[PDB]
Each structure stands twice: as C-alpha cells, then as structure tokens.
Design a binder for these strands. Structure first.
Ligand SMILES: [Zn+2]
Lengths: 142, 50, 62, 185, 41, 141, 67
RNA sequence: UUAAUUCCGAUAACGAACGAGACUCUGGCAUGCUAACUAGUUACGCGACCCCGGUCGGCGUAACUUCUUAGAGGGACAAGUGGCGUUCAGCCACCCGAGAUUGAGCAAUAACAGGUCUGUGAUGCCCUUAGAUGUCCGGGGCUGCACGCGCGCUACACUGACUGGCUCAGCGUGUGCCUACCCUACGCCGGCAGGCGCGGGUAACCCGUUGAACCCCAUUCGUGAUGGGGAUCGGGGAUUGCAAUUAUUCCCCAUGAACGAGGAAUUCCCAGUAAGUGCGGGUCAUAAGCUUGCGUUGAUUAAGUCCCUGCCCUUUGUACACA
C-alpha cells in the first residue's frame, strides 16, 4: 500500500536516535543490523522488554529503521529503546484505530515511564574553585 | 527494684533539702536571671506548670 | 518472656541533641488497647511493624 | 510473554516472605519484576523513595566503592549473575528464597549510642540497609589478596547467612551488636 | 546620577520598572434597567 | 542472503584471518617478531601471526568506511600512554606498520587506489566479502 | 517558601475592587483579564498575581475578606 | 511562616525605598509559524553483490522540515483533591502533567592602619643625577640542602597484570601589523624518534562524520616486596632556538627499591553528587604533575538539630571610652 512513514526521535541524553516506521514484513534494524550482536550481551533482554510484553503478533507488520548519533553505548540503548517505543505508539495512533492504541498504551504506562517520557537529567557544569561541581579544594591553614 | 524484690508494692521515699544561695552563688548555679526594669518590680515567682 | 510486635500509628516529634532519635507513638498490634511512647532511630513511617524483644521498656519525656 | 517474567531463568513466583515488617519495605514483588536490574537512577528524592528501589538493584549498586570500582555496574551485574549460578548449584532451592531468608535472619534491631549509652531500636529500612552494607563490606574484606572471586565470596556469605552458624560477616556483626546492646542496657 | 522614567523616552528609558505596575483607570458606566432596542442602517 | 553487518564482528575477523592464513601470500617480514606496535603499548603481541589480524581489520574497515589514510588507521590503534608517575594521556599508533599493511593489501588483488588518497574495495572483492559472510553464516548455522 | 509579595498584594486587591464584575473562579479566565487591564512585564509575575487573584476569589467564595 | 524586616496580626502609629524578593543568560517541551546545495530526511533512476527480494558515509535530480541550526511567542501558577494551621499568612501527601526546587550574575549601611609604590608616563616626599639606584652584552643565581610544613600526581593489585578484537562525545582551535610564528589531509623512507616534496580552508566547506579513556568479548598469569610500582641509574638515536650541563623535549634497551590498606590529628560534599577515566583553551623558540571548561560510566547514607567551631539580634551592670 502507501508508504506509512512515521519518523519519531528519541532523546534522553546526548545519544539520539530517529526511528522510521513502514508497512510490510517484520524486520527491525538499527542502521541495517538486528539486535543480536549487541555488546555487552548482558543488556540483551533490555531491548526485548518491549518485545516480550507485546508479543510476536504486534511486530509482524512493523519494521523500524533506526539511525543513531552521539552519546555513549548504554545511552544509545536507552535512546533507541525510547525512540522505537514512541514511534510504535505514533504508528498505532495515527493510522489504525484508537482502541488498540489504548490497549497497547495501558501496558506501557504500568511498566515504565522511560519508554514514553524522558527525564531532564543532564550534566551540570563544573564550578570554579573545585575538582568537580559540588566539591571544593582543601583549605590550607597555618 | 520492682522486678527484683522481696516485698510487694514498696513505697519510695523522697528528698527534702532546703537549699540556700547568695547573690554570687545563685547566678553561679544559674537559677535567677536579670530581667527588664519593668519586670524587676514583679515579686511573683515563675509559674509552676510542670 | 515472649517476643512481641508493635505498629506505628502516629509520629510525635524529634528528640535528642543532634536530632536522630524519633519520638514515635507505637501501637501494639497484639493488644490493640495499650500504647506507649518510644524513641526509634532511622526513617520511620506510619504502618510498619517493629519487633520488640521486650515490651517493658519505655522512653521518657525529653 | 507478559504472563510470566523470568529474571534470567527465575520467575517472580516461589518467593515466600515470612516477616511482614520487611515485606512492606522490600518492593521487588508485583511491581519491579524485571529481566535485568540495570537502571539510570532517581530513587533518592523522597524520604521513603529509597525503599521503592529493588533489592537486586541495591545489591548491584552497593558493591562499587573505594574509588577504583566506580563505573563497574556492567561488571557487577555479571558478577551477581554468576553468583546466582554458584548459589543454585550448591543449595538446590531458590536463591531468591535463600536471600529473603538471609535478610530475615540478618536484622540488627537494637543498638546503643552516645547521647550513658541509650540502647534503642532502629527502623526496618535501616535494618535492611545495614544488612546490605555489612554483607557488601564482608565480601569486599574477604575478596582481597585471594584467588577467590567476588561472586564466590558473595555466594559463600549468603549461604553462611542463610545457615546462621556465626560464620557470615553480617550475622556475626548482628550478634555482636545485639550482644553489646544487651550488655549496656 | 540616576535617570528618571518618562513616556517619551528622552530624559530616561522607555521600559518601566518591574516592581511598578501601570494600572489603568476604570470606566464609569450605569447598568441598563430597561431593554431598549437601537435600530440604524 | 546475509551481510557482514549481520555477521558478528568478533568471529568474523578470526574467520577472515583463517582465510588469509589459507592464502598465505601477504608479504610477512621478519622484523614483525621483534617490533613493538606503538610507544603507548608496553610489550610485543602474544600471538605470532598478528599481521593477518591487522590485515583482516584493515580489510573490513576499508569495506565499511572507504577513503582512509594513515591517521584513520592510527586512531583505532590506540590506548592509555602510561608514562609512569606522570598522568597518562592518549597516543596514536605507528605509521610504518599500517603502511606495510596497506602495501600488502594493495599487492593482493582485492582493493583499488582512489583519488585524493585511500584504497577502495573492488566489486571483485565485494563478491568475496559476501561469500565469506555466507561461510560464517553457514558455520554459525 | 512561595509567599506572595507586597507588589502582588497592593495590585490584586485594587484590581478586584475595580473590576469585581469581570472575574471568574477559573485561572485562564482572569489570567487574560489581567493582561487587558494591567501591564505586567514578566510571565512569572503575571502568573503569581493571577494565582493570588484566584486565591482571593476562593477567599471570597468561602467568606468575607477583611482587607 | 520562610533562604529573606516575605506576609497575616498586635496597633502610637501611618505612609515609602534600599538588600532580598523582583531582574537578566542558560536548560527541561511546543510533530502549531518562517527558513535552509557550507544541516539534512524520504524516495526515483544508475552501478556493485547474493538467491522475486535485501544490502551500499558509491553517483545525478523530485517533495519536506520528522533530526540539526535559531527570529517570534506558550506552559507552571500551589491551578485541582485530601489533611495541619487564627482557618489568616501559609505548610504537607496525591491524580494529571517535559518539568510541583537548573545554575550563575547584580548584590543595602558601615569599617579595617587587611594587601597593591614589584601592573601603570595614577601620584606626593627623600635619594641617585655621569665612574648613574638609568640603558646594553657574556655568564652565575632565581632550582641550590643536616631540618619542618603548604598545593598537587601515581601505585601498594586478582575487583587485578599482558596481547588483540569490538563500540561513542561536546567545549574548542586555526593562513597574520611590525613578525619568522597556523590547522593539518594523502602517497612514501624507518623498529620508534624524525625527514622529503605535495593538495583544502579565511571556515556547519579543510582537519572531521572528531572510530578519545573506562567499557564489553577472546588469549597468557596466580599470592611471590610479585608480571603491580618505575623512585634510582647507564649507553645510543632525533626535533626545537644562535647557543642545553646541573639532565629544554621526544624514542629504544638495561637497572627493579621504598610501598602488605596506614597511628595521633584533619579537609570537602550532600543527585547525573562524590568517585574512576579522558579531551580542548591559557601558560607555549621547546611546554603540563598548574588552572578552567567540555564529555562517558555511575553509587552509600539524609530530609533533623545547635551538643561541638564560627557569625547575626535581645534583655541589662556598665573595670568595654578621634570608642
Ligand atoms: Zn553562697
């Protein structure tokens, strides 16, 4: 059918990602690769937490292309986790009916807010006269 | 004493010592205190509430 | 000498010089009539259970 | 599947908590059922926001101390993941039930302080935090100039705490502090 | 030397003080007690 | 089919190093045994055939991001320059060993020189990369 | 320590005493009325004045105000 | 009552301002407006490869602001519910909501026998005034050493030591005024050090799309003042300025001590906080163990008080008097 293009950004930190949705078969890719060669292998289930709760039926028609820039590694993991979640919410919001979108949203509200809403946590600037922001130097007596 | 005793419900005595202090010794024991000039004329004691 | 239980129904204030001993009115969950006042350290809210080794101890007025 | 959540290979079920006091503060049941305990933060805003943090994430975060271990969360999650494998092969029962029983046993209730010494009780959240700090301190003290690893030392400390034969560091310090508090009262 | 405020902006600045609030004068009017039509055009 | 991005890069470099050991015509000198990699590194590499691993890494880096010279090769070969009691910094890799890797891969018929520097990968070598990706996929499956 | 200031208290009572008719319990109603009748330089001061006006309206709906 | 003389209230007090509050820059979000060939996105077609379809920071041109950049405005206010309190000022918990406390600057009156003549062609007085306390060259000294402290850096390891593989940032900076002094890209010579000619830029173009450290994965080690530590020392090879030894600086080999988690005493701080670990700017013929910003990972405890060290008012004898 027509090109159902949904471009949603995911921003939590310096690592940003843009998720692009489409109709067709189900193949989720992040710049042309799946989620199976992720280093470290400890956080393999962290990106599967939105996958296992919804099931294989919801990801049949949805294929997502993700471009990633900046930040670190785990910041990129949280960025793509927020971006594909908000893009999936927008995909079920705009085209298909609102009842199925509400049924999917009722799962995502109860579990975690990080999937939907980001928090304003950034690096505070270093102040003068100390090794960091809060800490100061040692005072020289005598 | 109420845990370990021979008698049951033994009444306790009290202390009765009439203390006396002078002008220097009362302030050294920190009992009296300098008040305002309108409050110096009051011969009333501080109120006994507890 | 049984090991008893209690329950915090209402906090009263903060005793001590540094302000670490919380004056807590504790309600006995075994006997729901009697209640005493004790000083309990740490963050104490209304609803938790405190396991008393003996219930004969009681904190005095500050 | 959303019906069951396997923490590695361990479900939410078969977790029985005997103490009703510690169950109100430990909030790992029915809300924080996760696959990995990794998170970003913000669990120290309210006075009682610290109890809403899960005890697996607390065991993860309390290991990294003393300068050189800062920034090794990816290390210590895999260390605890191997520690579950070390516990389950020797015990046979549920390591989550072993850890819940260890938290039930290792609770220092009364403790004296200098204000004479006033021997008073502490909070149950303070007992949980003291038990976690004593087990992490005992593991860090045991795993020093030794071939035995962090997961092996933490598994041995949890098995000794579940046994309760004055062998674990948390059990030993709990009995010592209760002995001192029983003495000076 | 401090410059005073002016509406024209010649002896001083044009922007008023943040603490000062210029409240206008309210209009005086009488409420109508009888419905009256007014037709024109 | 499969691709080298779908192939995990941990075993892909080992499989390509095994393929280059099966080839065995890539100009290995005798000062590789006595050379140190860079000044920030301390000692020699452990494995004796550590030219072919660098050749496999240079092959996949020129496949993914073509048009690279000496600095892009010295950037990936870096670490902590532990001088001693002084605070450590970052140091670049050596130039001549990467130049000899580029000369060996240019002598082998898998690349082609590009304008304004760089060695792009030929369509004949793209077929070989797809076939070895299929070989790694058949090995893992 | 969100205490309404004297620059708010001198203005809001005069505003309500003059335009007592054109008021409302809703915040967005009198927030735009204060934009018409008064000249407030900043949004934070505007919102503090409008919140104190709504608080005075709640005081009126509860009972009589002495001031 | 609060960070506040911030407000209710008591009223011989009423009416004002200064400091704070208030005000500016930055951050959290507005798929609603305008814009982008020195920022892009989605596709069309060509080329390469695998077996009807996928891959390409390989190329040419059709739509758009979903990413970036930034002119204009918004929202957030204790507004809604439940409790405490004169039911006043206000305070606390909760639903919904990008946020129910981002940081900084400006900072009232009054004073120090506080510092600065060694920043000043800002300056009073004294001295020098030709064999000059002025100006210039070659060295020395500013580093020096029985002793005591101040500010900093790295280790005392198995959580670690060695070797590769794998994967990310934003501050910046830069073709000359006398004046030579700028960033480096790419193909080579060599183990490194360093060297030869060569193209781009007056900068969202060039370095650069900043493959930075930690990190994760795969090999070697195993309780030994040890493979950790390089304090100590010798030989050779190069760059910088006219000129380096008491080592300007860099590279290779060899030498392998103190140090087994630290006594009395003491400093800093309370959420992207301490901490681990890097990178730019200034100092720069040669120039980071200094200082400031920019990043990545990321904890324990606490939501109270004047017991301890200070500062700020009070009642009052006044051995405290251009004080
Ligand atoms: Zn006397």
């Amino acid at each position: 059918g027509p090109l159902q293009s949904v471009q949603v950004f995911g921003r939590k930190k310096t690592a940003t990602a843009v998720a692009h949705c489409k109709r067709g078969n189900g193949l989720i890719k992040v710049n042309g690769r799946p989620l199976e060669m992720i280093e470290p292998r400890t956080l393999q289930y962290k990106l599967l937490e939105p996958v296992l709760l919804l099931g294989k039926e919801r990801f049949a028609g949805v294929d997502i292309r993700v471009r990633v820039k900046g930040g670190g590694h785990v910041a990129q993991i949280y960025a793509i986790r927020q971006s594909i979640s908000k893009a999936l919410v927008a995909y079920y919001q705009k085209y298909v009916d609102e009842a199925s979108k509400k049924e999917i949203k009722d799962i995502l509200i109860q579990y975690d807010r990080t999937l939907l809403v980001a928090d304003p946590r950034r690096c505070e600037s270093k102040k003068f006269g100390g090794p960091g922001a809060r800490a100061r130097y040692q005072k020289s007596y005598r | 004493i109420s845990e370990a005793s021979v008698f049951d419900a033994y009444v306790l005595p009290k202390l009765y010592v009439k203390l006396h202090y002078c002008v220097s010794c009362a302030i050294h024991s920190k009992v009296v205190r300098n008040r305002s000039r309108e409050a110096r004329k009051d011969r009333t004691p501080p109120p006994r509430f507890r | 000498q049984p090991i008893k239980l209690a329950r915090v129904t209402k906090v009263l204030g903060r005793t001590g010089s540094q302000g670490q001993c919380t004056q807590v009115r504790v309600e006995f969950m075994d006997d729901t009539s009697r209640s005493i006042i004790r000083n309990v350290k740490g963050p104490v809210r209304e609803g938790d259970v405190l396991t008393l080794l003996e219930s004969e101890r009681e904190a005095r007025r500050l | 599947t959303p019906d069951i959540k396997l923490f590695g290979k361990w479900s939410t079920d078969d977790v029985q908590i005997n103490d009703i006091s510690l169950q109100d503060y430990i909030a790992v049941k029915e809300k924080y059922a996760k696959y990995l305990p990794h998170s970003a933060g913000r669990y120290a805003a309210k006075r009682f926001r610290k109890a809403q943090c899960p005890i697996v994430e607390r065991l993860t975060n309390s290991m990294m101390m003393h300068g050189r271990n800062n920034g090794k969360k990816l290390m210590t999650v895999r260390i605890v993941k191997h520690a579950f494998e070390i516990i389950h092969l020797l015990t046979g029962e549920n390591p989550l039930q072993v850890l819940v029983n260890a938290i039930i046993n290792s609770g220092p209730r009364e403790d004296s302080t200098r204000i004479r010494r006033q021997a008073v009780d502490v909070s149950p959240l303070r007992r949980v935090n003291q038990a976690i700090w004593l087990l992490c301190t005992g593991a860090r003290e045991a795993a020093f100039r030794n071939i035995k690893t962090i997961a092996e030392c933490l598994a041995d400390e949890l098995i000794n705490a579940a046994k309760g034969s004055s062998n674990s560091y948390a059990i030993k310090k709990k009995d010592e502090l209760e002995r001192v508090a029983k003495s000076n009262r | 030397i401090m410059l005073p405020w002016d509406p024209s902006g010649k002896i001083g600045p044009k922007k008023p003080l943040p603490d000062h609030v210029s409240i206008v004068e309210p209009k005086d009017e009488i409420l109508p007690t009888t419905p009256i039509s007014e037709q024109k055009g | 089919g499969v691709t080298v991005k779908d192939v995990n890069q941990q075993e892909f470099v080992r499989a390509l190093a095994a393929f280059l050991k099966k080839s065995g015509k890539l100009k290995v000198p005798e000062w590789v045994d006595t050379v140190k990699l860079a000044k920030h590194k301390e000692l020699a590499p452990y494995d004796e055939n550590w030219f072919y691993t660098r050749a496999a890494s240079t092959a996949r880096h020129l496949y993914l991001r073509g048009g690279a010279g000496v600095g892009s090769m010295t950037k990936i070969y870096g670490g902590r320059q532990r001088n001693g009691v002084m605070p450590s910094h970052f140091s670049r890799g050596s130039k001549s060993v990467a130049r000899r890797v580029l000369q060996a891969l240019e002598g082998l018929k898998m690349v082609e020189k590009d304008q304004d520097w760089g060695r792009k990968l030929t369509p004949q070598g793209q077929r070989d990369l797809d076939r070895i990706a299929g070989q790694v996929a058949a090995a893992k499956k | 320590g969100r205490v309404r200031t004297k620059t708010v208290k001198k203005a809001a009572r005069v505003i309500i005493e003059k335009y007592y008719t054109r008021l409302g319990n809703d915040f967005h109603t009198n927030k735009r009325v204060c934009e018409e009748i008064a000249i407030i330089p900043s949004k934070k001061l505007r919102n503090k004045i409008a919140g104190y006006v709504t608080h005075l309206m709640k005081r009126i709906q509860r009972g009589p105000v002495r001031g």
